[PDB]
C-alpha cells in the first residue's frame, strides 16, 4: 500500500537508483511520527464499539427518513450493514494510522467507492455524517498530535466520500 516507506522505495525504484539522503530523511520522519499515530490507533481500537454505535445513531438522527419502512435504513439487516460499514471505515482509518499512509484507505475503501455506492444506492452523505461524528469523539478521545493524525486520516476518508 501507499505509505511513506513504500512511496520512497517506489520513487527510488522507478528511477532505478538506491536510497539517498532525501528518502532516508522521509523514512526518519515516518519512524518518528509512528508513536503518536500508533497510540492514536490504539485509542481508536479501544473505543471502537462506542464510536460505531454513536456514528450509526448520528446518521439516523441526521437522516430520520431512512429508518421508517420502505427504504435503505429500515430493517435489522440494513442497520447491521450500517454498523459493518462504519466499522470498516474505522478499521481502515486505524490501519492507515499504523501504516503512516493513506494506502489502506485508498486501496480498500476509496478505490471503487463511487461506482459501488452508486450501484447499491448508498448515499455518501450518510458516511460523511458518520465520519464527522467519529471526528467529534476523536477530538475528545485524543490529545496533542495523535488527535492530529487521526483527524488527517478521517478527513481524507471524508474528502474521498465528498
Amino acid at each position: 500500500s501507499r505509505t511513506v516507506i513504500t512511496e520512497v522505495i517506489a520513487t527510488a525504484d522507478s528511477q532505478g537508483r538506491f536510497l539517498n539522503s532525501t528518502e532516508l530523511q522521509a523514512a526518519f520522519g515516518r519512524f518518528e511520527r509512528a508513536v503518536p499515530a500508533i497510540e492514536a490507533a490504539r485509542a481508536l481500537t479501544k473505543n471502537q464499539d462506542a464510536l460505531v454505535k454513536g456514528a450509526v445513531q448520528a446518521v439516523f438522527k441526521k437522516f430520520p427518513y431512512v429508518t421508517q419502512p420502505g427504504e435503505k435504513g429500515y430493517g435489522d439487516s440494513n442497520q447491521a450493514k450500517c454498523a459493518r460499514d462504519i466499522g470498516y471505515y474505522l478499521r481502515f482509518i486505524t490501519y492507515s494510522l499504523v501504516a503512516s499512509g493513506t494506502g489502506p484507505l485508498d486501496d480498500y475503501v476509496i478505490a471503487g467507492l463511487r461506482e459501488v455506492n452508486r450501484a447499491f444506492n448508498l448515499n455518501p452523505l450518510w458516511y460523511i455524517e458518520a465520519l464527522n461524528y467519529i471526528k467529534g469523539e476523536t477530538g475528545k478521545l485524543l490529545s496533542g498530535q495523535s488527535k492530529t493524525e487521526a483527524l488527517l486520516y478521517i478527513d481524507h476518508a471524508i474528502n474521498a466520500l465528498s
Binding site: S1, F18, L24, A27, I38, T94
Partner: protein, 172 residues
C-alpha cells in the same frame, strides 16, 4: 509492494480484525529501532560499488570459466549485464532492509528472474554465489561501528542476511 506495517494490516484484514495490542507493540518496536535500520540501509547504499567490486573479484577468481571465451561473462556486454544484475540485487536488498519485508524482493526483484536466467542459460549457481559474496561483502560494512553510535544491531545483520539468502534461494 508491502512494508512490515502493510503486511500486518493485510494479515489483519483477512481476519476482519483491528490490529491487536501485541501487534501494535511489535510495530512500535520496529519504529523505535528504525534509526538503526536507516544506518544499515545507508551502509548498503554508500558502500555499494565496494560491495559489488569485491563480489565480482572473488566470483571471477573462484570461477574462471565465467570469463573465458564461451563463458557467461566473456564479452564486455555479458560482463556489463552481470555487474548490472549484481547492482540491482543489492539495490532491492537495501529496499527490503528499509521496508522490513521481503515483499519487495518477491514482487519485483525475484519475480521472473529464475526463468529469465534459465532461458538465457545463465548458471544460477554462480548467480547465487555472487549473491552470497555480496552478502559477505555487505556484512563487513553493516557491522562497521565507525562513525555511528554503537549499539546492538544483530537483528539487522540477521535480517539482511536472510534477504540475501532469499535472493540466492530464488535464483538457484
Amino acid at each position: 509492494m508491502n512494508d512490515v506495517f502493510t503486511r500486518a494490516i493485510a494479515q489483519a484484514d483477512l481476519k476482519g480484525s483491528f490490529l491487536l495490542e501485541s501487534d501494535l507493540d511489535k510495530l512500535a518496536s520496529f519504529a523505535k529501532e528504525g534509526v538503526k535500520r536507516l544506518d544499515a540501509v545507508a551502509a548498503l547504499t554508500n558502500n555499494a560499488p565496494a560491495i559489488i567490486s569485491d563480489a565480482a573479484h572473488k566470483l571471477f577468481a573462484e570461477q574462471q570459466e565465467l570469463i573465458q571465451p564461451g563463458g557467461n561473462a566473456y564479452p564486455h556486454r555479458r560482463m556489463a549485464a552481470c555487474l548490472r544484475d549484481m547492482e540491482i540485487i543489492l539495490r532491492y536488498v537495501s529496499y527490503a532492509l528499509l521496508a522490513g519485508d521481503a515483499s519487495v524482493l518477491d514482487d519485483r526483484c525475484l519475480n521472473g528472474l529464475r526463468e529469465t536466467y534459465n532461458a538465457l542459460g545463465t548458471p544460477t549457481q554462480s548467480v547465487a554465489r555472487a549473491v552470497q559474496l555480496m552478502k559477505d561483502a555487505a556484512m563487513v560494512h553493516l557491522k562497521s561501528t565507525a562513525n555511528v553510535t554503537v549499539g546492538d544491531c544483530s537483528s539487522l545483520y540477521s535480517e539482511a542476511a536472510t534477504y540475501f539468502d532469499k535472493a540466492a534461494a530464488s535464483i538457484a
